[PDB]
DNA sequence: GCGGACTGCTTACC
């Protein structure tokens, strides 16, 4: 096989390689680099090299990367550009690996693992790290096995060995219910005492050094806690021996809190790719609350404190800690956020842990696609952050709109840039601009007959490529091939869905089938004969799939979109107010510009005039009323709600984007663009059921609306979806409750009517002082909490969260046992009666959590249901329903009198 | 006494 990388480092003047050779083996070595960078030269000494704006430059080999670096600083010192990769590690990544890199996953070792430490006062700080590591499970991907390390006796108590036998039984046997497929991949080793433990650990790990290193917060826990307890123990020395080079570099960031670095590894701590990769926003990011969410497990159910569970219950203890570290595994099989981070690594040839660096990932990228064609990159340069102008968004009339159809541009902003072909080294001047709306009514003069322009007066080459539109077509081709298969999964997931109507009381088998590809004629045949089992089990991997190809292409969607946000950092090789606000500006142009012709050619093939269709838009969006689309054909000529459906869609297809191709193309033509590539396509059909009292959507403003949507991007549902954006119901700061209430009213408005939505209400109202507290607890994040701390309380304009807080520490006062709020992180909060104990009107306490036994029972007693009510459902209620011009609870009338 | 304007904060949409 061909060679690929695995770790690099930079160490003074020696490059530190981990990597896979050419019979599969992992081997490292020590590189004296010899880096080369550029400086202009007269137009005489041409060679092979130029800058990407065509000017000449000399290459300077230095002897070593310390002689590279200080003759950066002397060419800053005289005021000349020093060109060139600067970050050596990727010029030498770009060296040796000359070739677009084919990797063999099952080669990189993968490292899985996660601590435990009992800490009878508070908190176990990791820069302190003063209590013993009484457990570690340490999962390899090469062994595929759980390595697990059990400290027996501690001064926290002296336990009995776990047993495999107990651990594997049923929770109602009084077992532990860990999953039987990881029984035989588990590895158990009891200690006596905590240093023969972390002494084995170090052997194992130098034996198995983990190339990814990953687990649940293992950046600000695990590895800072493990390298801390090894450091005080036996010395730094031996606290090294985690880097494979033996080179560690301790990060402080007091405000103690540490950050260790070890080079050698490319830590990607699984919460950190959540995060960034997910796109969900968690109330809680507990393991535990996580796991649930992804995987549907229950809770993992224990009695008493976390502090205590290794003293009262050690089997149950270790076993939750081997599950804890398989929780990772089974959301990475979900999610593959390690894929995708092996992936774009190698694609762009960086050190993997880079990924979560947009600008560090483009900047390697561009690099290398310079490099090939002997071009030479630009010296960074120091720039003052500025503001500049977005996207467009329509203010909607506040209503409900009974029939509608959106619209949306194809991957919008990387489009623009290849449509224009914005580049820094596509510049080709400037030209004087008119009023935003007179490109937008047609009314402005055509920029350039020569260049390719932007609203904003830059002008692009039409004929030279720009390796921005260059290297941003590659990703995208790739999220296209990968949304296809998402699509096409979740098409075949509404199949099944269907078939659940009528399953055949049978014995049958889980058909074999790839669900990125649509069902042949013959699949969906057997799928109607077969049972409830195999279609549910069929259910669940068609989502797998779907979920699998969303992950591949909503992140390369972000990594695109991250490059046009790049041209506006300042921290971006190629930053460029010019370039960013030519995307923007012609983005704004072009949203603007469609609903003017959708309009036109609506207002003429519905026979009206001056009617407004199109009733909002965000960016690159539109979302037309169709209503008299529907009129001009009459309701009363549709055989059910599924055949108005299938008319808008052929409606949509057949007349409405060929329309909407026709207006693109001329602004493509009067901005003299390089290539037209504005693909609006159909998104959303969205209606009431058929003959029902349902309103099908409504607007309260910008970014809030709702709709009863019959299919998304050509998805036909078995069951009409609610397509709802930016209200309560989405967000994690409402109450799970209050959300799943809020919905359900929506739910009732849009497909039911008024009468509907006023029986539920009612309802809702009499009965919710019975749901669980945590149900109805707000949520927030918890920032600046000492900001607003003086002297146990609330300062000046302390936010309403940050005196729940403050409160919560004034009620936990005195024991240490007490969990903690942390700073950032996440908290419930629940308003208080006026006459509690609390002297306050609210208490805030540790999301994902429940609230601590010291003085749960009181908050219990004191939660005030009335403000709950009133703030979180009733207000929200109001806002939707006042839109809608309806009513949730029924108005007095004259009758009555009756 | 409290509404409206403005501010900080939070979390959406794109
Ligand atoms: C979601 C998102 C959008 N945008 C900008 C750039 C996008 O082109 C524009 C519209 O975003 P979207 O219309 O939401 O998505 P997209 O057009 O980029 O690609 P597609 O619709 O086919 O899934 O908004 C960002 O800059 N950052 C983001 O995170
Ligand atoms: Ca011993
Ligand atoms: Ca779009
Ligand atoms: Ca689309
Ligand atoms: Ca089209
Ligand atoms: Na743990
Ligand atoms: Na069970
Ligand atoms: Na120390
Ligand atoms: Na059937
Ligand atoms: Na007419
Ligand atoms: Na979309």
């Given at each position: ?9 930079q ?32 137009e ?24 590279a ?8 010192d ?49 820069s ?7 457990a ?29 036998e ?26 006596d ?17 983990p ?17 801390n ?14 880097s ?12 103690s ?8 590894i ?39 404190p ?109 489009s ?28 402005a ?49 509404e ?21 990125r ?10 799928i109607?004969?077969?049972?409830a ?15 699998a ?140 059921p ?91 994040s ?31 006062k ?36 429940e ?48």
């Amino acid at each position: 096989m061909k060679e690929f990388y695995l770790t690099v480092e930079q160490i003074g003047d020696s490059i530190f390689e981990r990597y896979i050779d050419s019979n599969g083996r992992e081997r490292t070595r020590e590189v004296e680099y010899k880096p080369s960078l550029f400086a202009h030269c007269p137009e005489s000494q041409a060679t092979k090299y130029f800058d990407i704006y065509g000017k000449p430059c000399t290459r300077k080999l230095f002897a070593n990367m310390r002689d590279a670096s200080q003759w950066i600083k002397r060419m800053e010192d005289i005021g000349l550009e020093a060109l060139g990769m600067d970050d050596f590690k990727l010029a030498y990544l770009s060296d040796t690996y000359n070739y677009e890199i084919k990797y063999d996953h099952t080669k990189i070792r993968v490292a899985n693992f996660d601590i435990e430490v009992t800490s009878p006062d508070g908190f176990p700080e990791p820069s302190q790290a003063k209590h013993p590591i009484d457990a570690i499970t340490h999962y390899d991907s090469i062994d595929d096995r759980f390595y697990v390390f059990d400290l027996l006796n501690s001064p926290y108590g002296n336990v009995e060995e776990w047993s495999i036998e107990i651990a594997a039984k049923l929770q109602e046997q009084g077992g532990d219910e860990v999953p039987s497929e990881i029984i035989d991949k588990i590895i158990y080793m009891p200690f006596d005492n905590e240093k023969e433990l972390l002494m084995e650990y170090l052997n194992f790990w130098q034996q198995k050094t983990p190339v990814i290193l990953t687990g649940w917060n293992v950046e600000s826990f695990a590895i800072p806690y493990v390298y801390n307890r090894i450091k005080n123990i036996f010395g730094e020395s031996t606290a090294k021996r985690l880097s494979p080079h033996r080179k560690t570099r301790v990060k402080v960031i007091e405000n103690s809190r540490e950050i260790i670095t070890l080079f050698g590894i490319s830590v990607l701590d699984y919460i950190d790719l959540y995060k960034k990769f997910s796109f969900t926003n968690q109330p809680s990011y507990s393991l535990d609350y996580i796991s649930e969410f992804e995987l549907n497990v229950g809770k993992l159910k224990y009695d008493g404190p976390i502090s205590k569970l290794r003293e009262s219950n050690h089997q149950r203890y270790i076993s939750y800690n081997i599950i804890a570290v398989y929780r990772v595994l089974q959301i990475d099989a979900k999610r593959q956020f390690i894929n995708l981070s092996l992936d774009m690594g190698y694609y762009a040839k960086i050190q993997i842990q880079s990924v979560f660096s947009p600008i560090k990932t483009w900047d390697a990228i561009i690099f290398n696609s310079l490099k090939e064609q002997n071009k030479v990159i630009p010296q960074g340069r120091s720039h003052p952050v500025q503001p500049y102008p977005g996207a467009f968004v329509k203010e909607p009339i506040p209503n409900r709109y009974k029939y509608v159809m959106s619209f949306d541009l194809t991957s919008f902003y990387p489009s623009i840039i290849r449509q224009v072909n914005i580049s820094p080294e596509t510049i080709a001047g400037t030209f004087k601009v008119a009023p935003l709306h007179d490109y937008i009514n047609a009314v402005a003069e055509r920029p350039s007959d020569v260049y390719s322009c932007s609203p904003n007066g830059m002008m692009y080459y039409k004929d030279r490529d720009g390796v921005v539109p260059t290297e941003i077509t590659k990703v995208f081709n790739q999220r296209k091939e990968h949304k296809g298969y998402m699509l096409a999964a979740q098409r075949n997931g509404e199949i099944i869905k269907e078939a659940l109507h009528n399953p055949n009381l049978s014995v049958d088998e889980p058909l074999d089938v790839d669900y990125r590809f649509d069902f042949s004629d013959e699949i969906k045949e057997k799928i109607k004969k077969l049972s409830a089992k195999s279609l549910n089990e069929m259910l669940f991997r068609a989502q797998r799939t779907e979920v699998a190809g969303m992950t591949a292409q909503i992140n390369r969607k972000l990594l695109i979109n991250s490059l046009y946000g790049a041209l506006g950092n300042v921290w971006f090789r190629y930053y460029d107010l010019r370039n960013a606000t030519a995307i923007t500006t012609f983005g704004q142009m072009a949203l603007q510009w469609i609903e003017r012709k959708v309009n036109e050619y609506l207002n003429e093939v519905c026979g009206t005039e001056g009617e407004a269709f199109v009733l909002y838009g965000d960016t690159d969006s539109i979302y037309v009323s169709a209503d008299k689309i529907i009129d001009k054909v009459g309701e009363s000529k549709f055989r059910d709600t599924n055949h108005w459906v299938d008319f808008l869609d052929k409606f949509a297809r057949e007349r409405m984007e060929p329309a909407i191709d026709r207006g693109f193309r001329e602004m493509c033509e009067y901005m003299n663009n390089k290539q037209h590539l504005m693909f609006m396509d159909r998104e959303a059909i969205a209606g009431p059921p058929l003959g029902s009292k349902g309103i099908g959507g409504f607007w309260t403003g910008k970014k809030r609306y709702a709709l009863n949507v019959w299919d998304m991007e050509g998805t036909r549902y078995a069951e009409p979806k609610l397509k709802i954006m930016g209200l309560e119901t989405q967000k994690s700061s409402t109450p799970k409750a209050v959300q799943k209430a809020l919905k359900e009213c929506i739910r009732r408005m849009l497909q039911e009517g008024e009468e509907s939505l006023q029986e539920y209400f009612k309802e809702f109202e009499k009965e919710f002082r019975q749901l669980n507290y945590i149900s109805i607890a707000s949520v927030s994040s918890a920032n600046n909490i000492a900001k607003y701390d003086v002297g146990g309380f609330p300062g000046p304009k302390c936010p309403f969260h940050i005196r729940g807080i403050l409160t919560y520490n004034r009620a936990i006062k005195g024991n240490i046992d007490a969990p903690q709020v942390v700073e950032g992180e996440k908290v419930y909060v629940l308003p208080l009666r006026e006459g509690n104990p609390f002297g306050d009107k609210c208490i805030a306490w540790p999301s994902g959590t429940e609230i601590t036994d010291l003085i749960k029972d009181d908050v219990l007693h004191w939660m005030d249901y009335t403000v709950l009510l009133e703030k979180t459902f009733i207000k929200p209620l109001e806002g939707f329903t006042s839109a809608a011009k309806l009513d949730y609870e029924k108005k007095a009338s004259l009758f009555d009198m009756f």
